[PDB]
Design a protein around this ligand. Sequence first.
Ligand SMILES: CCCCC[C@H](CC(=O)NO)C(=O)N[C@H](C(=O)N1CCC[C@H]1CO)C(C)C
Ligand SMILES: [Zn+2]
Ligand SMILES: [Zn+2]
Ligand SMILES: [Zn+2]
Ligand SMILES: [Zn+2]
Length: 181
Amino acid sequence: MEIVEYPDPILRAKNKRIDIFDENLKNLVDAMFDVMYKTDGIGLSAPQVGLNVQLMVFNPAGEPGEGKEIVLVNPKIKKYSDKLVPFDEGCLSFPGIYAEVVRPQSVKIDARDITGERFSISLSRLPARIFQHEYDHLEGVLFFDRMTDQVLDSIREELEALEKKYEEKTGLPSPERVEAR
Ligand SMILES: CCCCC[C@H](CC(=O)NO)C(=O)N[C@H](C(=O)N1CCC[C@H]1CO)C(C)C
Ligand SMILES: [Zn+2]
Ligand SMILES: [Zn+2]
Ligand SMILES: [Zn+2]
Ligand SMILES: [Zn+2]
């Protein structure tokens, strides 16, 4: 397996609805959780492992045998809180890069579980925070898109190093560039 890193276009591509809730889905969810634990994450989205599908997993404890292994399929945000809060985020698609992101404190959500049963849920605190980060991935939105210009400027060179890596590996110019913004 391989975590897909910025600026790979897979991270910007449209993600398809999941219609089939079967063993292949369960296997993928397991693999994603295992990637998360191996890499010290607290959540992961399907495009980050190379699959453009509306699937996210997370565990707000981030540790084996702790917290809850939360799976959300075809999620939709129904409401964001007016209240905003800052929090330092990293993203497994941007190794080593951490910066302040301001997001709504809480969200109301519609999604499906791993069996395909639909549910409504309200999230707050860290779970809300993780959720919105992973939800943005499913919408082809990356965390620096959410940063202020001042915060973005502080990570520009780190982002360009990732653009260079992609350019060196592929021999192609990067399909997006932080400087364009
Ligand atoms: C907070 C918003 C959720 C972030 C989810 C990411 C994983 C990811 O890229 N999901 O798409 C993560 O685990 N990031 C970690 C992260 O940001 N953490 C881990 C503990 C708390 C926070 C740092 O303040 C590390 C790997 C950089
Ligand atoms: Zn591999
Ligand atoms: Zn496993
Ligand atoms: Zn750890
Ligand atoms: Zn991420």
